[PDB]
Design an enzyme around this catalytic site. Structure first.
Site, PDB file in Angstrom:
ATOM      1  N   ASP A 198      -6.101   8.552  -0.121  1.00  0.00           N
ATOM      2  CA  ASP A 198      -5.636   7.519   0.801  1.00  0.00           C
ATOM      3  C   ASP A 198      -4.397   8.009   1.540  1.00  0.00           C
ATOM      4  O   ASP A 198      -3.525   8.648   0.948  1.00  0.00           O
ATOM      5  CB  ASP A 198      -5.294   6.208   0.078  1.00  0.00           C
ATOM      6  CG  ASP A 198      -6.422   5.715  -0.807  1.00  0.00           C
ATOM      7  OD1 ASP A 198      -7.575   6.129  -0.583  1.00  0.00           O
ATOM      8  OD2 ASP A 198      -6.150   4.892  -1.700  1.00  0.00           O
ATOM      9  N   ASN A 208      -8.700   5.496   3.379  1.00  0.00           N
ATOM     10  CA  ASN A 208      -9.381   6.365   2.430  1.00  0.00           C
ATOM     11  C   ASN A 208     -10.213   7.442   3.120  1.00  0.00           C
ATOM     12  O   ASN A 208     -10.951   7.169   4.072  1.00  0.00           O
ATOM     13  CB  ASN A 208     -10.302   5.560   1.516  1.00  0.00           C
ATOM     14  CG  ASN A 208     -10.641   6.320   0.249  1.00  0.00           C
ATOM     15  OD1 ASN A 208     -11.299   7.344   0.296  1.00  0.00           O
ATOM     16  ND2 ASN A 208     -10.225   5.797  -0.887  1.00  0.00           N
ATOM     17  N   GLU A 261       0.820  -1.207   0.000  1.00  0.00           N
ATOM     18  CA  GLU A 261       0.000   0.000   0.000  1.00  0.00           C
ATOM     19  C   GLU A 261       0.857   1.261   0.000  1.00  0.00           C
ATOM     20  O   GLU A 261       0.556   2.219  -0.714  1.00  0.00           O
ATOM     21  CB  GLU A 261      -0.934   0.024   1.203  1.00  0.00           C
ATOM     22  CG  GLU A 261      -2.099  -0.957   1.110  1.00  0.00           C
ATOM     23  CD  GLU A 261      -3.161  -0.514   0.120  1.00  0.00           C
ATOM     24  OE1 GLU A 261      -3.077   0.635  -0.353  1.00  0.00           O
ATOM     25  OE2 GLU A 261      -4.072  -1.315  -0.180  1.00  0.00           O
ATOM     26  N   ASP A 263     -15.483  -4.215   9.763  1.00  0.00           N
ATOM     27  CA  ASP A 263     -16.740  -3.770   9.169  1.00  0.00           C
ATOM     28  C   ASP A 263     -17.423  -4.837   8.318  1.00  0.00           C
ATOM     29  O   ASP A 263     -18.486  -4.564   7.749  1.00  0.00           O
ATOM     30  CB  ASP A 263     -16.511  -2.497   8.341  1.00  0.00           C
ATOM     31  CG  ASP A 263     -15.925  -2.772   6.949  1.00  0.00           C
ATOM     32  OD1 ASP A 263     -15.465  -3.905   6.653  1.00  0.00           O
ATOM     33  OD2 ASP A 263     -15.928  -1.825   6.130  1.00  0.00           O
ATOM     34  N   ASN A 320      -7.550   9.414  -5.246  1.00  0.00           N
ATOM     35  CA  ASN A 320      -8.371   8.554  -6.074  1.00  0.00           C
ATOM     36  C   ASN A 320      -9.158   9.413  -7.047  1.00  0.00           C
ATOM     37  O   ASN A 320      -9.245  10.635  -6.900  1.00  0.00           O
ATOM     38  CB  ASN A 320      -9.296   7.699  -5.214  1.00  0.00           C
ATOM     39  CG  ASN A 320      -8.530   6.918  -4.155  1.00  0.00           C
ATOM     40  OD1 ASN A 320      -8.889   6.919  -2.980  1.00  0.00           O
ATOM     41  ND2 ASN A 320      -7.450   6.276  -4.569  1.00  0.00           N
ATOM     42  N   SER A 367     -11.429  11.532  -3.348  1.00  0.00           N
ATOM     43  CA  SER A 367     -10.919  11.165  -2.039  1.00  0.00           C
ATOM     44  C   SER A 367      -9.416  10.885  -2.128  1.00  0.00           C
ATOM     45  O   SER A 367      -8.829  10.834  -3.210  1.00  0.00           O
ATOM     46  CB  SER A 367     -11.677   9.966  -1.488  1.00  0.00           C
ATOM     47  OG  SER A 367     -11.465   8.833  -2.312  1.00  0.00           O
ATOM     48  N   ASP A 417     -12.343   9.643  -7.591  1.00  0.00           N
ATOM     49  CA  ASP A 417     -13.520  10.311  -7.044  1.00  0.00           C
ATOM     50  C   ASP A 417     -13.175  11.522  -6.177  1.00  0.00           C
ATOM     51  O   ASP A 417     -14.089  12.126  -5.608  1.00  0.00           O
ATOM     52  CB  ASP A 417     -14.374   9.322  -6.240  1.00  0.00           C
ATOM     53  CG  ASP A 417     -13.789   9.012  -4.873  1.00  0.00           C
ATOM     54  OD1 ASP A 417     -12.559   8.861  -4.766  1.00  0.00           O
ATOM     55  OD2 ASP A 417     -14.561   8.930  -3.895  1.00  0.00           O
TER      56      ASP A 417
END
Ligand SMILES: [Cl-]
Ligand code: NA
Length: 129
Positions: free
Chosen positions: A52, A59, A35, A101, A46, A50, A48
């Site tokens: 990281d 994110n 990562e 989650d 990213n 957003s 969209d």
């Protein structure tokens, strides 16, 4: 801060990540390697809008506030900049919620694509833990 492989394994293990939700320590180190290349200051934007953040590339769309992801959640209830500290505590605590989650470590695309189903114990081989 750029971590050594064993240095990061030790820090992660001290923060309760070893076998957390069934994910052995090598899974977490493998994910961080791909990562962020073990760099706590890594950021990646990213499409969209957003971003990281940090060693685990958490994110901003869901997990942290960076003030520039409109309509995003802050489920770890921290500013994304706290995830670039040399202290990995905030990244680790947030990772613990993400992995809980329901999707496990599949939340990390690099883990899904590069660690899952591989010999992840080789990432902690040779380390004094
Ligand atoms: Cl990938
Ligand atoms: Na956010």
């Amino acid at each position: 801060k750029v971590f050594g492989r064993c240095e990061l394994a030790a820090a992660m293990k001290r923060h309760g990540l070893d076998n957390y939700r069934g994910y052995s320590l090598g899974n977490w180190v493998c994910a961080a390697k791909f990562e962020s290349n073990f760099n706590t200051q890594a950021t990646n934007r990213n499409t969209d809008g957003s971003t990281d953040y940090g060693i685990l590339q958490i994110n901003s769309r869901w997990w942290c506030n960076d003030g520039r992801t409109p309509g995003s959640r802050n489920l770890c209830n921290i500013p994304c900049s706290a995830l670039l500290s040399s202290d990995i505590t905030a990244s680790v605590n947030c990772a613990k919620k993400i992995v809980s989650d329901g999707n496990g470590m599949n939340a990390w695309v690099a883990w899904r694509n590069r660690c899952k189903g591989t010999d992840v114990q080789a990432w902690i081989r040779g380390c004094r833990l």
